[PDB]
């Protein structure tokens, strides 16, 4: 899997949005969470149309989306697939999730997991929900993890062949490595 | 790609339905097309719920679906992606295409490309349309082909690594091989 591909947009944005907005800890430090519009510009950068339409009114919607996706991802990390499925199914019903083909300005045809007339927060809700749902269908639930590092509860999706990744980031991987000698 | 997998159901059923119902020629012989309910029982065998609900009233709907999918697949084989996209988008709008997670009786979670309360022909229309649409999004249009054998216009999706398959079936591959010496 290429987590940066168009095809994994919903998965990638879900992880990134939860990791921005969900309070907890990040890379060894308490993390306040929430977000500001600048976080959304960078979150949604792969879609110039979204970025062109973002306003401060979208922040509350993305914070709420983050809360819902965090609950689902945490459920998946615990094997509580039914809990995640119930929530994702409701999002797919509530928001416009009819797929639609369209051609990017460079000519590339894409399958969008929403109609092009969707509103912005409903659109991203559908995209994110389908992306997580798809990974459940693809039997990848065990690849959703919560960072094993001290004072980090950021989420990750393990893209390794072996499926034994423990840490959310190279940052946490490095922090653990750098503590190994002294903690021996 | 595994064309027999759950994940390629829409693609597989689309090809099979077109090849049953579309008049033309098949494996060297004129092909009348149409279908009967027995064709649908075998077409949809991977879904016991569909098979349990099939009736003769569904035959007309599947013949019409076949006509629409044949037009799309023939368009794809010609690189006429916009023509295919317009038709597939309309099917996805017309029919229930909201995805839904559910657990098979064996416990396996699946992403269905329709709500579980869908009617039978609308359901299969959505499944088939999404399956074809997905392959357009995955940049696989050039893998949709029309058999090169004499008096065969059956369709196929090339699953080979090299993407140079010419014939719809081992049957047509063998018929061509068996004619090579005499036609030399
Ligand atoms: Na919906
Ligand atoms: Na941790
Ligand atoms: Na629809
Ligand atoms: Na032919
Ligand atoms: Ni999109
Ligand atoms: Ni289904
Ligand atoms: Zn971490
Ligand atoms: Zn053939």
Numbering used by the authors:
A (entry chain A), B (entry chain A): 1 to 184
What does the paper say about this structure?
Structural analysis revealed a two-domain organization, with the N-terminal domain consisting of a new fold that we call the ABATE (for Alpha-Beta-hairpin-Alpha TandEm) domain and the C-terminal domain forming a treble-clef zinc finger that we have termed the CGNR zinc-finger domain after a characteristic sequence motif that is conserved in this family.
Furthermore, residues 146 (a hydrophobic residue) and 167 (an aromatic residue) are highly conserved and could intercalate between the DNA bases. However, given the prediction that the C-terminal domain binds DNA, then the N-­terminal domain may allow the protein to act as a signal-dependent transcriptional regulator with the ABATE domain conferring sensitivity to some as yet undefined ligand.
